[PDB]
Design an enzyme around this catalytic site. Structure first.
Site: not given
Ligand SMILES: Nc1ncnc2c1ncn2[C@@H]1O[C@H](COP(=O)(O)OP(=O)(O)O)[C@@H](O)[C@H]1O
Ligand SMILES: Nc1ncnc2c1ncn2[C@@H]1O[C@H](COP(=O)(O)OP(=O)(O)O)[C@@H](O)[C@H]1O
Ligand SMILES: Nc1ncnc2c1ncn2[C@@H]1O[C@H](COP(=O)(O)OP(=O)(O)O)[C@@H](O)[C@H]1O
Ligand SMILES: [Mg+2]
Ligand SMILES: [Mg+2]
Ligand SMILES: [Mg+2]
Ligand SMILES: [Mg+2]
Ligand SMILES: [Mg+2]
Lengths: 526, 98, 532, 528, 93, 155
Positions: D61, D94-95, D391
């Site tokens: 994550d 998030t990335t 997630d």
């Protein structure tokens, strides 16, 4: 552990901060000597790192004793030295002018004007300043000694020697006039080499005078030498009058009994031969830059000749100039021409507790010695500095006989002319032009400030006065704070000094304006 | 105007273009600058907007006062002139309401 | 695993480090490019200040650690040595090439393809410059030299003074002109002795119609001025004779010592008499002269100068026709000095320059020489003036040797960028990206000029690119190839008509050197730094 | 500069201003981006970070990796903060947000270096982001039938797409189906605390199970607990918040007696109070007794003698989950234990799971909660499985909120880039360069996918650009076949909210970084 | 030393703090005046405790003579500067 | 190949990103995989000597000097004072096997070491590690199915 492009100690800064720092450093340098300008200036006491004391109010003398870290201040100090060396006067004025122009340039740099535009405006203003100064100048008759004395007086009214003004002016004028030389179609003054200033603490300053010859701090080598000769014939030498080794290795090999005695006798005979070669010209005084042997002294004295030894090369050259002699290395080549006739008296007298040799009656001498006698060493050093300023001013006037009104009159006139010229450019660079034109008013302003009078009222009155037609010579009285025409007060400056001051100040401003980056810390790499 | 990243002594990061906040988070040490900061904070407390105007106007006034002192005036004369001009400005201001 | 005593960087890390070092070096000197550029203050932590705008000087004085930054510094030095101008442009171009090439590599383009594309782009750029953007100087005349000198001296301490300094430089260069075999007019710059002396303004800088020596007479006895000079140049000292190492004087009869000691100086006396018997007036020697020989010269009314520099002596001898004599030995084993070994000058005067004196050898015959005296406000200003003057002399020499010049103000860079962007579509499939990035990197010069001028760099460069694109697309608009930049007004301007020129050799050599440096640094992908 | 005898700011204050500090800020953002650059896509890789005390965290994550990094650069911390915001609002992407923001900054760096005013860049970013968000909302695919099978398949595909980058990507279908099943039994609030996640060491990944009820670890049983039966076939659960043990009646209570008879009466009164509470609980009809407060040994033996089950010190959230699933009510007073405050479940059982004892409450038809029992080989394995499941759960919840989906694999980024380039080709030109730079920066995601997969990024990007130019909205990177494919027909589905939030957050972060001109760092206080 | 460096361009007079090098207590208590002379990479003059042989407020000439006592001293004024490839000059050829 | 990215600027000003970034190491790409594979190989090769009827015991000493002669793989690895994170992962693998099954806590370590040893030479040939993991998972499924096929029931 760490990896870097440049060295660890290499520090770099750039931008508006660098320009602000340079201008602030220049303003600080100007503020250091701001109060040392004008006839009402106050002296300063400088403590040397060696323990000595310098007490003066000269710009260059003050600035050369200050150690600074900011390179802008180093540049300003170098500017002071350049002004002192080139013309000898105007050292405080150039620093003050450079500070003022850099301040008025910082004003524009705060806005969005590129420094190059300011530099171009400064160069145009410098050209116009040169033109105006050449226009408002007046000629000087160098033959009139009274006018030259007045010029020197106006030059030295601002120094500590001003209380004895006639004496100092006469000394400087006589020294400059008699050191003047003209050989092979070349004219030279050469205040640096000849016209040496010798200071002896004690006595009174009014006893100081310029000699018609050269005085050195030497005594006769033997007591039976004559210490007073009426009309001596002087011979100057370089080589020693003693037996000395040759260049090559010349070891001897003695096998017979009498060879040692023969060698000693030949040494004595060589000394006698040298002395006979000297005597054959029938002189009265022999001066040598090197030693004279005791046997040589005896052989010279048998012919009634006064001998002085171990004299400096500069002193020997000055003596040769004064008494019309020629320095001869090998005595066997002495001719009648080389003998110096023209000295009208030679005397070795005692001053205090030391002997001094005087050759002080030469006819038509090309070198002189200024004998300063004052309260102490520091007072005499200040007097010597003031005399140097006076002689430099005299030489500048003699080279260029143009003259310029002083006491801020010339600067106010130039500023008004430049403003009138700027009234017609109608461009974008007109503002820096007019600003650097009005920046010349700093020296009348500081003259008024040092006088203690009101700056604003006097400056406004002077600016209004210069707006008339024939008012280029209207300046400020330095010791009363009143507006007086300078064809009445008589304060005038040589054109060369003013030209050098303006050029040097404007070019210093240009040089410090062209810089926006400072990198420091790197090793010399040598 | 451009935002400014101001990091105080407590690792608290402020990004803003508010003059009062920037002055609050800056470790101002000069007493005169402290006084001007106090004036700006008082302006913020009284009205809530105009702190940067206060700072800019005070800086310009002090710079021009320095110029006036340099040309040869006295501090009292500059102060009296500033007070008279401020009164005149306060008189003019109501007429400029649109 | 490796057990090597040191650090290791591999892959994108070392490439990014190299690009960072090159970019830092470029940013050091990016602010000193173009007429709106500004100089720099350099302090060597001892109190010595060097105010300079030259990129080569700045990069030389700085002490650098990273190898790639050192590579860029040596690149600037090489450009200075082989051309004399453009030392900043070459570094900026090399750094931009490296940055764009590394971006391409980070886009998974193999560095070999990038290098091949860069090489092809450099070849095509040189060919395009030599085919289209060169202006022959045959029909321009002395105006071309004046404009080239003015352009070179822009962005320097002698910028606005170009109207006078360019004439001075051109006169000096034409004065030192000589022709050699193969019918080549070669201009030996560095024969102009540059003398610095603070004092009067820049307008008072003097161009001597002869040679200037930073030397004075050895003694005050000799005259300081000689009208009809007969210069005698010598390469040996005039002192008391000394026996060599292998000769030793041993005395067994006391009667001979005085004769030995007398002849020990009679030898030099006879040599000086032989020299002076032919009418020589000025005697210059590299060695020292002691007091006795100085007096021998004084009595004859000559001018003797000692410790003259070897290069100065060679230049004086060449200009005046004198032959440097290391010894007074002829082919018959005798000691003779023929009259033919004498130079001739119209005057030799010892002038005074700000409480200092130098010797002016004026109007030498059989050859015309030149020297320059630079008058400034202090030493730093004089040094910067000397550096800028040397740059101008090198530029004028380049323009006179090769009769081709190109328009300045980024015009050539913009034209090259447009042409290479058009051309990249006709070569390769993956190196075309490298060619396009080379073209884009070539635009760093006009961008830097516009940024230094604090103008709208984006819009100004867009206008310049549009002008050059219209020139290259429409056959009838070839006159637009000269559109460059007017930095003072911030508008495009026809630089060829405006008088902004520079030698073609500067651009060609800068392009080649920058491409080679970028290729060299681009090959590195692994660094091992052993611990000292 | 000048020494200035008295200075303005405190000594040690550092101020950096102008273009150089903005370029340094962009470089710092790039450095932060490359920290999570290789964690994107089905070919992404995990990162291991060790703290000061030696504990190791292994995560894919992006938000977790950025949080574990002790970032102190003021401009770089913005990327970490926007990653946290993306994790909070949506939970996925998030990335992608950090990569997008850093690519925006990198693309506008060349214009920054040449003196372009940052306000123009900010305006261009705002316009491009608004247009891109509108385009995403316009072209997003939704189904207007509300068919239960269709929604089930859509949620499962979204969960599979979300999960197909973690260490559980091999079993992504199993976990995706389990996550959808878990989420659908939440009623209306979709509270995360109503989905328990239990990590039990030892066992294969496929051994993980979803409990249609509640399950929790055994909680410090007292003496006599092993006598209680451990399986019931229709138990009634007495959910209590009561301390069932002998103790002082009140903290400030004091007993004053003067007769031994009163002493014995007081002792008997304490015992009778305890037995009255226990007898009320027993007469309530319950067979399983759960209490938040400790249950003493005496109560344990009393319940063992009645063939009852007791478990004290139960965690409060576990009791809430039990109440929600079985359907009782937590009681602080045992005086009114009506039939409606007792939970019901088909089967209660205590079983050993990997060396631990877990109480199971299954067979609840009216269950509104779940319990994930994750089996793994180590602490970090189970923690990363939990993060991946979180997630997926957030993705499924957002899809429940609105069933608007877009194709992944860079297909949406290619479509947005093509649209933005087409728009930028019709404006005067100052904004055209910046909008084109924005569109080019939008290409980072497929390029990063290809780079992580060991592909040739340039060829795939060229093919995708050519495809999108001539038609085909949902063409993206096909990792398995080393080519491009219609990602929408490959069931690589993402909610449009993920990309909308990613674009909005990246644009806002880029504008905030660009808008700054000077950074001031005050000297530290109390360094000690 | 300032005056000596001014007069002597060859010599490399330099100063360094005693504590920076890290001298012992005895050096810091009775060996402050130390004249360290380097030649050839090795010491040739190692004067310490020079107050008795020099004084306390001695002049430049005094220390110069003291250094000259052991033969420690190795044996015009330009305008500002003179030093400006290798192409020098040719003529016609 | 450590200290993160040691640049400290592009211009010359300070460039600080991560707190104490000058005292932190970093391994990237294939080098980290090689280090992890080598560490796991070392642990597995140490543990493999205690396998089978002829396996030899290991004799642990804790920080207090107490002696524990044992053959249990989980016990051996639990008392091992490791600092490498991959070694801790292998210890936790043994603990998981002990918790779920209670036997074969040594065979798991040897199997993991052999798998990583083969993966090393597979990575040396340019295969992406995720491909290796997918192949390992597929082969594990095949092996588990075969084990179910060849299984025998007991009373
Ligand atoms: N009697 C006077 N009244 C007014 N001004 C004077 C008088 N005497 C000299 N000055 C002015 O003072 C200046 C000389 O000041 P000085 O101390 O020599 O500074 P600097 O060395 O820089 O010239 C001259 O420019 C001159 O105009
Ligand atoms: N008057 C001018 N107008 C426009 N551009 C100019 C002018 N003079 C010089 N330039 C350009 O400025 C650039 C920078 O030159 P400069 O940096 O001074 O030379 P160097 O690189 O040798 O230091 C040159 O490429 C030249 O084309
Ligand atoms: N099966 C797939 N094929 C191609 N690309 C995929 C697939 N599944 C996910 N992706 C891509 O992976 C990216 C997200 O990667 P991931 O690390 O799972 O979440 P995050 O958005 O937090 O990085 C998305 O941009 C998506 O396009
Ligand atoms: Mg004066
Ligand atoms: Mg406001
Ligand atoms: Mg140039
Ligand atoms: Mg995801
Ligand atoms: Mg076993």
């Amino acid at each position: 552990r760490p990896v870097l492009v440049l060295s660890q100690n290499t520090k770099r800064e750039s931008g508006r901060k660098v320009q602000s720092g340079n201008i602030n450093a220049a303003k600080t340098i100007a503020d250091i000597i701001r109060t040392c300008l004008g006839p009402k200036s106050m002296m300063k006491m400088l403590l040397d790192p060696m323990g000595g004391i310098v007490m003066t109010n000269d710009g260059n003398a003050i600035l050369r004793e200050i150690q600074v870290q900011h390179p802008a201040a180093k540049s300003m100090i170098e500017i002071s030295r350049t002004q002192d060396e080139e013309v000898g006067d105007g050292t405080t004025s150039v620093i003050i002018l450079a500070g003022e122009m850099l301040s008025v340039a910082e004003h524009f740099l705060e806005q969005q004007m590129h420094p190059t535009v300011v530099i171009s405006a400064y160069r145009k203003a410098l050209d116009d300043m040169i033109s105006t100064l050449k226009k408002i100048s007046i000629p000087v008759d160098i033959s009139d000694s009274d006018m030259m004395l007045n010029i020197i007086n106006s030059s030295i009214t601002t120094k500590a020697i001003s209380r004895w003004s006639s004496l100092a002016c006469n000394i400087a004028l006589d020294a400059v006039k008699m050191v003047q030389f003209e050989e092979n179609g070349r004219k030279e003054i050469d205040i640096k080499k000849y016209a040496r200033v010798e200071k002896i603490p004690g006595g009174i300053i009014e006893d100081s005078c310029v000699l018609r010859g050269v005085m050195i701090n030497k005594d006769v080598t033997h007591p039976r030498m004559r210490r007073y000769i009426k009309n001596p014939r002087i011979v100057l030498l370089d080589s020693s009058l003693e037996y000395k080794k040759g260049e090559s290795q010349t070891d001897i090999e003695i096998t017979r009994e009498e060879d040692f005695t023969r060698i000693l006798q030949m040494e004595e005979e060589y000394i006698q031969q040298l002395c006979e070669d000297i005597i054959q010209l029938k002189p009265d005084v022999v001066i040598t830059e090197k030693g004279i042997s005791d046997l040589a002294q005896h052989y010279l004295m048998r012919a009634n000749i006064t001998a002085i030894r171990r004299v400096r090369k500069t002193d020997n050259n000055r003596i040769a100039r004064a008494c019309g002699a020629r320095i001869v290395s090998r005595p066997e080549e002495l001719r009648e021409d080389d003998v110096g006739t023209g000295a009208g008296l030679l005397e070795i007298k005692k001053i205090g507790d030391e002997y001094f040799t005087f050759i002080t009656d030469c006819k038509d001498p090309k070198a002189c010695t200024i004998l300063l006698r004052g309260a102490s060493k520091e007072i005499l050093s200040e007097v010597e500095r003031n005399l140097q300023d006076a002689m430099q001013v005299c030489r500048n006037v003699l080279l260029d006989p143009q003259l310029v009104p002083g006491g801020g009159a010339s600067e106010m006139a130039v500023a008004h002319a430049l403003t009138e010229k700027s009234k017609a450019m109608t461009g974008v660079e007109q503002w820096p032009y007019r600003a650097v034109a009005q920046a010349l008013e700093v020296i009348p302003r500081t003259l008024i400030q040092n006088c203690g009078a009101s700056t604003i009222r006097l400056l406004t009155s002077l600016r209004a006065k210069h707006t008339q037609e024939n008012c280029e010579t209207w300046g400020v009285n330095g010791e009363t704070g009143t507006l007086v025409d300078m064809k009445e007060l008589g304060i005038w400056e040589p054109l060369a000094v003013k030209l050098q001051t303006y050029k040097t100040a404007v070019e210093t401003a240009v040089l410090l304006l062209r810089i926006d980056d400072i990198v420091s810390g790197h090793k010399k790499k040598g | 105007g451009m935002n400014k990243m101001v990091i105080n002594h407590l690792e608290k990061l402020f990004v803003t273009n508010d003059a009062a906040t920037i002055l609050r988070e800056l470790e101002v040490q000069h007493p005169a600058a402290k006084m001007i900061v106090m004036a700006s904070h008082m302006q913020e407390q009284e009205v809530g907007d105009g702190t940067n105007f206060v700072l800019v106007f005070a800086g310009a006034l002090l710079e021009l006062a320095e110029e006036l002192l340099r040309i040869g005036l006295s501090v009292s004369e500059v102060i009296e002139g500033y007070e008279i001009a401020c009164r005149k400005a306060h008189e003019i201001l109501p007429n400029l309401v649109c | 695993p490796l057990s090597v005593f040191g650090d290791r960087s591999t892959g994108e890390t070392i490439r990014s480090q190299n690009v960072m070092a090159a970019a830092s070096i470029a940013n050091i000197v990016k602010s000193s490019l173009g007429p709106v550029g500004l100089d720099k203050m350099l302090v060597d932590d001892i109190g010595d200040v060097t105010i300079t705008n030259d990129g080569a000087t700045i990069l030389k004085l700085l002490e650098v650690e990273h190898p790639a930054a050192k590579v860029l510094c040596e690149l600037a030095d090489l450009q200075d040595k082989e051309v004399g101008d453009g030392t900043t442009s070459v570094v900026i171009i090399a750094a931009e090439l490296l940055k764009n090439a590394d971006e391409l590599v980070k886009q998974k383009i193999h560095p070999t393809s990038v290098i091949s594309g860069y090489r092809l782009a450099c070849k095509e750029a040189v060919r395009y410059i030599n085919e289209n953007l060169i202006v022959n100087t045959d029909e321009l005349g002395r105006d071309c030299l004046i404009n080239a000198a003015k352009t070179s001296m822009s962005s320097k301490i002698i910028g606005i003074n170009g109207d006078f300094f360019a004439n001075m430089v051109v006169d000096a260069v034409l004065a030192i002109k000589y022709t050699d075999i193969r019918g080549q007019p070669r201009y030996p710059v560095n024969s102009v002795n540059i003398l610095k002396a603070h004092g009067r303004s820049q307008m008072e800088s003097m161009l001597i119609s002869g040679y200037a020596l930073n030397c004075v007479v050895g003694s005050q006895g000799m005259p300081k001025r000689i009208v009809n000079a007969k210069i005698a140049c010598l390469d040996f000292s005039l002192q008391k004779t000394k026996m060599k190492l292998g000769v030793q004087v041993v005395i067994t009869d006391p009667e001979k010592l005085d004769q030995i000691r007398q002849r020990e100086s009679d030898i030099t006396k006879e040599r000086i008499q032989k020299i002076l018997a032919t009418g020589a007036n000025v005697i210059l020697t590299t060695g020292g002269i002691d007091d006795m020989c100085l007096k021998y010269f004084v009595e004859a009314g000559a001018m003797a100068v000692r410790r003259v520099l070897k290069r100065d002596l060679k230049r004086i001898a060449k200009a005046s026709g004198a032959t440097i004599l290391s010894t007074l030995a002829n082919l018959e084993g005798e000691e003779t000095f023929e009259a033919a070994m004498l130079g001739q000058a119209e005057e030799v005067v010892q002038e005074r320059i700000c409480d200092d004196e130098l010797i002016l050898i004026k109007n030498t015959k059989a050859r015309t020489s030149a020297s320059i005296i630079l008058r400034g406000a202090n030493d730093f200003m004089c040094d910067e003036m000397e550096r800028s003057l040397h740059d101008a002399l090198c530029v004028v020499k380049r323009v006179l040797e090769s009769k081709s010049v190109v328009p300045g103000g980024g015009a050539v860079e913009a034209a090259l960028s447009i042409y290479l962007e058009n051309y990249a579509t006709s070569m390769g499939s993956r190196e075309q990206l490298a060619i396009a990035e080379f073209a884009r990197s070539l635009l760093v010069i006009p961008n830097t000029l516009a940024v230094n001028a604090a103008q709208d760099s984006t819009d100004l460069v867009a206008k310049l690119r549009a002008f050059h694109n219209e020139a290259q697309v429409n056959p009838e608009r070839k006159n637009l190839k000269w559109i460059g930049l007017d930095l003072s007004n911030g508008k495009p301007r026809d630089n060829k008509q405006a008088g902004v020129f520079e030698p073609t050799i500067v651009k060609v050599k800068s392009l080649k050197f920058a491409t080679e440096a970028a290729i060299t640094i681009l090959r590195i992908d692994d660094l091992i730094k052993l611990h000292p | 500069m000048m020494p200035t005898p008295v200075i303005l700011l405190k000594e040690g204050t550092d101020s950096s201003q102008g273009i150089p500090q903005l370029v340094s800020n962009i470089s710092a953002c790039q450095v932060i981006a490359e920290a999570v650059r290789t964690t994107l896509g089905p070919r992404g890789m995990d990162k291991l970070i060790v703290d000061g005390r030696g504990k190791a965290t292994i995560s894919n994550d992006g938000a977790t990796i950025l949080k574990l990094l002790d970032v102190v650069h003021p401009a770089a911390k913005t990327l970490v903060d926007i990653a946290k915001s993306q994790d909070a609002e949506v939970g996925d992407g998030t990335t992608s947000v950090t990569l997008l923001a850093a690519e925006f900054l990198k693309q506008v760096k060349p214009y920054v270096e040449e003196g372009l005013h940052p306000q123009i860049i900010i305006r261009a970013f705002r316009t491009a982001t608004q247009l891109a968000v509108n385009k995403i909302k316009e072209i997003a695919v939704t189904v207007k039938k509300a068919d239960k099978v269709e929604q089930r398949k859509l949620l499962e595909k979204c969960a599979m797409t979300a999960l197909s980058s973690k260490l559980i990507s091999q079993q992504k279908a199993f976990f995706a189906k389990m996550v959808v099943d878990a989420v659908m039994m939440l009623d209306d609030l979709l509270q995360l605390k109503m989905i328990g996640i239990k990590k039990v060491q030892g066992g294969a990944l496929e051994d993980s199970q979803l409990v249609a009820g509640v399950a929790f670890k055994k909680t410090f049983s007292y003496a006599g607990f092993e006598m209680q039966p451990k399986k019931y076939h229709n138990p009634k659960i007495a959910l209590l918040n009561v301390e069932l043990e002998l103790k002082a009646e009140k903290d400030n209570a004091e007993i004053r007696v003067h007769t031994v008879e009163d002493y014995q009466a007081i002792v008997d009164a304490e015992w009778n109070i305890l037995y009255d509470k226990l007898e009320k609980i027993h007469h309530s009809g319950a067979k399983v007794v759960l209490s938040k407060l400790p249950i003493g040994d005496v109560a344990t033996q009393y319940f063992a003698d009645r063939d009852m089950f007791c478990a004290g010190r139960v965690p409060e959230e576990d009791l809430k989950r039990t109440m929600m699933a079985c359907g009782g009510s937590i009681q602080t007073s045992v005086n009114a234990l009506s039939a409606d405050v007792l939970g019901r479940c088909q089967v209660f059982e205590e079983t050993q799971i990997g060396g631990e004892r877990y109480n199971f409450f299954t067979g609840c038809p009216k269950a509104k909660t779940c319990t994930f029992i994750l089996r793994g080989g180590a602490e970090q394995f189970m923690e990363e499985t939990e993060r991946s499941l979180h997630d997926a759960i957030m993705i499924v919840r957002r899809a429940i909120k609105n069933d608007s989906v877009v194709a992944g694999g860079g297909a949406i980024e290619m479509e947005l880039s093509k649209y933005l380039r087409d728009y930028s080709r019709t404006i005067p030109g100052k904004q055209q360069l910046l909008i084109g730079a924005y569109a080019k920066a939008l290409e980072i995601i497929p390029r990063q996918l290809c780079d992580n997969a060991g592909f040739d990024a340039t060829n795939i990007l060229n093919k995708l650009r050519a495809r999108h130019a001539q038609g085909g909205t949902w063409y993206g990177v096909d990792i398995n076949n080393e080519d491009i494919a219609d990602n929408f027909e490959a069931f690589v589905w993402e909610p449009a909210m993920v990309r909308i939030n990613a674009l909005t957050a990246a644009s806002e972060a880029a504008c905030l970084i660009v808008s700054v001109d000077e950074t001031i760092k005050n000297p530290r206080s109390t360094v000690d | 030393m300032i005056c000596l460096a001014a007069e002597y361009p060859a010599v490399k007079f330099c100063k360094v703090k005693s504590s920076v090098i890290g001298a012992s207590s005895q050096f810091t208590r009775n060996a402050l005046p130390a004249l360290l002379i380097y030649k050839g990479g090795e010491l040739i003059g190692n004067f310490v405790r020079v107050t008795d042989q020099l004084g306390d407020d001695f002049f430049a000439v005094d220390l110069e003579a003291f250094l000259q006592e052991f033969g420690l001293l190795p044996e015009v004024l330009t305008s500002v500067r003179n030093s400006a490839s290798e192409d020098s000059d040719l003529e016609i050829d | 190949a450590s200290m993160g990215t040691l640049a400290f600027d592009e211009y010359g000003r300070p460039f600080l990103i991560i707190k104490d970034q000058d005292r932190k190491s970093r391994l990237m790409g294939l080098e980290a995989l090689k280090s992890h594979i080598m560490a796991a190989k070392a642990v597995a090769n140490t543990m493999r000597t205690s396998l089978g009827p002829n396996g030899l015991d290991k004799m642990m000493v804790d920080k207090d000097g107490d002696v524990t002669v044992t053959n249990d793989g989980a016990t051996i690895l639990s008392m091992m004072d490791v600092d490498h994170q991959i070694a801790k992962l292998m210890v936790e693998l043994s603990k998981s096997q002990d918790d779920e099954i209670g036997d074969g806590t040594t065979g798991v370590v040897v199997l993991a070491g052999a798998l990583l040893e083969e993966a090393e030479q597979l990575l040396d040939r340019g295969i992406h590690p995720i491909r290796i993991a997918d192949g390992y998972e597929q082969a594990a499924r095949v092996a588990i199915e075969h084990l179910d096929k060849i299984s025998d029931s007991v009373l």
